[PDB]
């Protein structure tokens, strides 16, 4: 079942170059099983990091318009209600 999508707030740690680097990710999401998945396959896209080196510390659940990162809260914003200001 869709539904309005959930922004998860994730706080972990990626290996990169033998070195713990802590992240802050806010993802849109339904569940948790989704949460993994999309982060092993955005840090692969974006940064090109193996799977089984990224490591999630943090799952924090999110509200729509409170989420920082610009691009995450617009993708958001693509499903909800076009505000009518006459």
């Given at each position: 079942m869709?539904?309005?999508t959930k922004i998860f707030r994730v706080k972990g740690?990626?290996?990169m170059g033998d070195k713990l680097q802590p992240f802050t990710k806010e993802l849109n999401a339904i569940r948790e099983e989704e949460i993994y998945e999309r982060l092993y396959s955005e840090f692969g896209?974006?940064?090109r990091v193996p799977?089984?080196?990224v490591k999630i510390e943090e799952?924090?659940?999110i509200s729509p318009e409170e989420v920082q990162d610009p691009?995450?809260?617009?993708?958001?914003?693509?499903?909800?209600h076009h505000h009518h200001h006459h």
């Open positions: 869709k539904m309005k740690k990626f290996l896209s974006k940064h799977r089984s080196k799952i924090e659940e691009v995450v809260k617009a993708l958001v914003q693509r499903l909800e």
